[PDB]
Design a protein around this ligand. Structure first.
Ligand SMILES: CC(=O)N[C@H]1[C@H]([C@H](O)[C@H](O)CO)O[C@@](O[C@@H]2[C@@H](O)[C@H](O)O[C@H](CO)[C@@H]2O)(C(=O)O)C[C@@H]1OC(C)=O
Ligand SMILES: CC(=O)N[C@H]1[C@H]([C@H](O)[C@H](O)CO)O[C@@](O)(C(=O)O)C[C@@H]1OC(C)=O
Ligand SMILES: CC(=O)N[C@H]1[C@H]([C@H](O)[C@H](O)CO)O[C@@](O)(C(=O)O)C[C@@H]1OC(C)=O
Lengths: 182, 189, 188
């Protein structure tokens, strides 16, 4: 299915939050012409961020997906590449899933000011899906330079509310979209 | 694909919050291949939650869409199935649909609910949680929780549940009339 | 499955307070009977370019007004020069399939034309969310998207973006929004 690129819907541990494969990132990208429709959720399984409270610091971490100029996931990404593939051999290109570098340029007169906001999508998510357990997600397009990436999608996850009773970092699903490179 | 399953865009009262058809649920599910793109909004028209304030309790209610193995709406659902159907223009195909499995939330992504950290099942991923705004006013937050496959009622194969509520103190009564909310989810097929 | 858009890296193309004082980036993509949209706003000069608690009002309104063919009316805050389908071209002739449904989101009615037997939703034609200035989690603002709620220019359809904030900002910050995704039911 050339219209869906994903982690598979029920992944094994596939994502580094603190150490490699300590988390399960479920990410599906679906191509709707020139816009990608995405859904993302994160379950931290082991380690520092599996169960959080107010004494865990910092209260944010970053998950980078780094892509080359063919849209292939680079091995330095926090997301393990083993099962990152079209919905059904590692794929050879996925440029049409990549966030536009014209809409969302890599970092570099009022008419020369570059938007610092437009390459980010920021919202609350809710741990365990509970309305009284807000956290946040920041989706960032093409803001990384690591591994000489041509494209990137970064997920920053965190929280700010004071939690004295420890709770699993297990996020509600978040929908977003972005302008595709082609 | 690219078909829509919906309540019609201008439904008559079609949904139970407290009693049958005491509310207008507008819900459209549009298939974008492996994901469903959805928009939902609720106007409660009569009963306990039509007009809310800080003296209305509890401050949450639940609307269950329960589906069988063909993705057909079960009678126990809060939504009346009379006008829950595939789109035709601004209305519905006349005959009740026979199957809608491609519109169901995946039971692989969102399994039905059932100490080893390695076997932990995500409690978050089957829910989408956000503020909505009553009357579309920025100063009238409430909330929506969309839940996939979390019901057991009527031996459903699939479910979509909408929990609506609010937390802010409203001393003056206001209608429970939500801003539209967009979400997507992984489709069963 | 076409996209109607401002182009992804627009030149100043929008009036918040004065012509060309802002850059609105907006893409509408058709997915059958729903439009999938992404929007963001960079105010580049004037009252709302750098905001703080001493600026009032703390909301402003960007109207996209369309005629019966889905064509952008020049009265809109958005300049229509580069509002067109994604692809040297011609202004588009029709985009009704991209308009917000007037059955889902009807225009306001008069005392004359209001049916007292029907309760009309005031919320359903609005989408309301936070956006974040600079994409910083500690700089919330808000966006309100409104469908078909204008009467300006005898529009057949409209999409209105209200942007604002409520948090007290002592130190001034640029009104430069994170991107916001939404969808709506299309006219056809
Ligand atoms: C959509 C949105 O951001 N709404 C928020 C409104 C809004 O900012 C104002 O009505 C616009 O002027 O403000 C809310 O309350 C905040 C309060 O939470 C904060 O601590 O103080 C500010 C004033 O400085 C407001 O009083 C509101 O009216 O309830 C919050 C609301 O946002 C949310 C997420 O509910
Ligand atoms: C989904 C929602 O609306 N969650 C809100 C929650 C809820 O309304 C009450 O818990 C209901 O009782 O109230 C809060 O104050 C809270 O932290 O608990 C704020 C929280 O909203 C945010 C943006 O974090
Ligand atoms: C994305 C998010 O959740 N931002 C929240 C922010 C954040 O949690 C801390 O800044 C992290 O440390 O905290 C706030 O109190 C703040 O104003 O700064 C509330 C704000 O949420 C809203 C709905 O405005």
């Amino acid at each position: 299915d050339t219209r869906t690129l994903w982690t598979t819907p029920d992944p094994s541990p596939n994502c580094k939050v603190e150490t490699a494969r300590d988390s399960k990132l479920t990410l599906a990208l679906t191509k709707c012409g020139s816009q990608i429709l995405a859904t993302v959720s994160l379950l931290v399984v082991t380690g520092k961020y599996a169960i959080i409270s107010d004494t865990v610091n910092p209260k944010q971490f970053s998950i980078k997906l780094l892509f080359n100029d063919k849209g292939v996931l680079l091995s330095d990404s926090n997301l393990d590449g083993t099962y990152w593939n079209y919905r059904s051999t590692p794929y050879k290109e996925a440029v049409g899933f990549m966030p536009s570098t014209t809409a969302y340029p890599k970092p570099t007169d009022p008419d020369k000011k570059v938007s610092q906001g437009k390459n980010k999508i920021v919202s609350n998510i809710y741990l365990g899906g509970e309305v009284y357990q807000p956290g946040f997600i920041v989706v960032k397009f093409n803001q990384e330079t690591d591994a000489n990436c041509a494209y990137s999608i970064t997920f920053d996850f965190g929280w700010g509310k004071v939690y004295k009773d420890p709770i699993p970092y297990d996020t509600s699903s978040f929908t977003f979209s972005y302008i595709a490179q082609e």
